[PDB]
């Protein structure tokens, strides 16, 4: 499963390929995927 | 011969003061 975030109530959800795309708490139909937890390198220039 | 500035940031206070 992968973790998604609701776009209105900021609820952190976990959805599978079978689960419908919607917030199980408030019902919003847009979910923002969680940011990667792996380090990303940047240059300070 | 004139004032080439849009005097602001204290004319609002100036008008609010005399009122």
């Amino acid at each position: 499963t992968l973790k998604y975030i609701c776009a209105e109530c900021s609820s952190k959800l976990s959805l599978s390929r079978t689960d419908a795309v919607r917030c199980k708490d408030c019902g919003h139909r847009i979910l923002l995927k969680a940011r990667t937890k792996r380090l990303v390198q940047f240059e300070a220039r | 011969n004139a004032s080439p500035f849009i005097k602001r940031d204290r004319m609002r206070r100036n008008f609010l003061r005399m009122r």
Binding site: I5, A7, S10, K12, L32, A34, R35 | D9, R10
Partner: protein, 69 residues
């Protein structure tokens, strides 16, 4: 969006004078010219960096965070 760290023309650090500039204007009732000179910005390249800056970060902060911890 936020006060630049350095002056573009000469590289003088001006990012640590934004709060001081605002404090002088509000509390001390100083005009923009005196506040800039008080902060030590003599070259007009530095003066325009702080004088013409627009603080858009405050407007963005009005929106709620996309992700809350």
């Amino acid at each position: 969006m936020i006060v630049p760290v350095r002056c573009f023309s000469c590289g003088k650090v001006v990012g640590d004078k934004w709060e001081s500039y605002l404090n002088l204007l509000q509390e001390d009732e100083l005009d923009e010219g005196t506040a800039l000179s008080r902060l030590g910005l003599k070259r007009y390249c530095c003066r325009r960096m702080i004088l013409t800056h627009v603080d858009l970060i405050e407007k963005f902060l009005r929106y709620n965070p996309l992700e809350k911890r």
